[PDB]
Write an enzyme that holds these catalytic residues in place. Structure first.
Site, mmCIF file in Angstrom:
data_model
loop_
_atom_site.group_PDB
_atom_site.id
_atom_site.type_symbol
_atom_site.label_atom_id
_atom_site.label_comp_id
_atom_site.label_asym_id
_atom_site.label_seq_id
_atom_site.Cartn_x
_atom_site.Cartn_y
_atom_site.Cartn_z
ATOM 1 N N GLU A 1 12.395 -7.369 0.503
ATOM 2 C CA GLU A 1 11.302 -7.664 -0.247
ATOM 3 C C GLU A 1 9.959 -8.099 0.639
ATOM 4 O OE1 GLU A 1 12.867 -7.549 -4.132
ATOM 5 O OE2 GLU A 1 10.564 -7.713 -3.441
ATOM 6 N N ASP B 1 3.195 -6.405 -6.815
ATOM 7 C CA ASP B 1 4.370 -5.664 -6.251
ATOM 8 C C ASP B 1 4.393 -4.217 -6.659
ATOM 9 O OD1 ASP B 1 6.786 -6.497 -8.953
ATOM 10 O OD2 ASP B 1 5.075 -5.206 -8.999
ATOM 11 N N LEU C 1 8.246 -12.886 -8.627
ATOM 12 C CA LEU C 1 7.380 -12.307 -9.555
ATOM 13 C C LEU C 1 6.570 -13.614 -10.351
ATOM 14 C CD1 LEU C 1 6.180 -10.082 -11.238
ATOM 15 C CD2 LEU C 1 7.920 -10.728 -12.568
#
Ligand SMILES: [Cl-]
Ligand SMILES: [Cl-]
Length: 162
Positions: free
Chosen positions: A11, A20, A32
């Site tokens: 990530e 993203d 998120l």
């Protein structure tokens, strides 16, 4: 290697709101914020998650905190899911980590829809499952990450991450 390190590799780490791979507002270690196209909405969700007026920026410690919570939540979603729990319980520790990675990325729902792959994993048919997992939007959209995860299920080692 462990789940945390694995996910920190997949990530990355960003201390400012970013979008993203799907164009959604995110921050930290793949946290998120919102699927809404509004930045303000994103900034709002952020302050509420942090508990202060962040103005879009967070510290390293705040990122890590969200990260911990997120990892914990992914585990719990697995355990709470009637289709997934049995699969997860049937596997070794390395492979469990691969499964947590996917839920973290795609949510519980997303993952619970890989029915056929889930069956194969439960059956310990590693190569087959690996082929089935690759027939997916997931693999087509983020192939490099997808390959790392798939190798992980296929081999039961951390080699894709070494
Ligand atoms: Cl939160
Ligand atoms: Cl990727």
């Amino acid at each position: 290697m462990n789940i945390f390190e694995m996910l920190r590799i997949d990530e990355g780490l960003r201390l400012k709101i970013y979008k993203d791979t799907e164009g959604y507002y995110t921050i930290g270690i793949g946290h998120l914020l919102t699927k809404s196209p509004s930045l303000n909405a994103a900034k709002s969700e952020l302050d509420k998650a942090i508990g202060r007026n962040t103005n879009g920026v967070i510290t390293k410690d705040e990122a890590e905190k969200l990260f911990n919570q997120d990892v914990d939540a992914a585990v719990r979603g697995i355990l709470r899911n009637a289709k997934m729990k049995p699969v997860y319980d049937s596997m070794d520790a390395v492979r469990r980590a691969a499964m947590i990675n996917m839920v973290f990325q795609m949510g519980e729902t997303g993952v619970a829809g890989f029915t056929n792959s889930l069956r194969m994993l439960q059956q310990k048919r590693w190569d087959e499952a690996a082929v089935n997992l690759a027939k997916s939007r997931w693999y087509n959209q983020t192939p490099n990450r997808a390959k790392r995860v798939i190798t992980t299920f296929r081999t039961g080692t951390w080699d894709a991450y070494k």
